[PDB]
Design a protein around this ligand. Structure first.
Ligand SMILES: [Cl-]
Lengths: 103, 113
C-alpha cells in the first residue's frame, strides 16, 4: 500500500550500539541465534524520480495550500541483549509524516 | 513550533499480546512468559504504537488523515507493523522463537487518486 512517506524496511545485522530507555548508549551484543533487528526508515531521494514522500521532504498527498510537512523516521523500543542483560533500545520502526505548520 | 501528527498515535507497554501474525502470514500464540532467555526468566511484553480510536475531526484510526488534500486523495490512518523476535507456540503447544508482527506506528495510507 501507497503511503504519505515511502518506507524502506530491513534486517539490521551489524547494530553494535543503541541509545537505551535512559538516553544512554549501550553495547548491543552481536549474538545470543545471532541478534538482529527489523528496522524501518524513510526512502532517500532519487534523482530520476524526485517528487514527495522521501526522507526529509514534504509528504505525499498533503495539501500544500494549508500545510508544510516532513517525512521523518519514527522510533520504538525493542528488547535487546546488551551490556550484560535485556534492555529496551531505540530502533527505527517507521517513516511518519509530520505537519510542522500552517502554510 | 506546534507540530501536528497526520494520524494520531497511542503508544504503550502491551502485556496482554497473546496472538500475533508471524513472518510468513501465520497466526501463532504469543507467550506471557519466557523461562530462560537471558541468564534469567522474564515477562514477555512489547512496546507498541497503534492508531487512536475516536464527531470531532480526522486523524483517528480508520478515518482520513490530517492535512491531506481531500480533492485528490482518499486516505486512511492505519497501524503499521514491524517484526520482533518473540517466544511463541505451534502444534499442540510446541514452543519456539519466532519473528512476529507488532504495531510500531499509526501511518497515513493513500488509498487512491
Ligand atoms: Cl504517516
Amino acid at each position: 500500500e501507497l503511503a504519505v512517506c515511502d518506507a524502506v524496511s530491513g534486517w539490521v545485522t551489524d547494530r553494535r550500539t543503541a541509545v537505551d530507555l535512559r538516553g544512554r548508549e549501550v553495547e548491543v551484543l552481536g549474538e545470543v541465534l545471532r541478534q538482529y533487528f527489523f528496522e524501518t526508515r524513510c526512502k532517500a531521494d532519487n534523482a530520476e524520480e524526485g517528487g514527495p514522500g522521501a526522507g526529509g521532504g514534504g509528504c505525499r498527498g498533503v495539501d500544500r495550500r494549508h500545510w508544510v510537512s516532513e517525512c521523518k523516521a519514527k522510533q520504538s523500543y525493542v528488547r535487546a541483549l546488551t551490556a550484560v542483560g535485556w534492555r529496551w533500545i531505540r530502533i527505527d520502526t517507521a517513516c511518519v509524516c509530520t505537519l510542522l505548520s500552517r502554510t
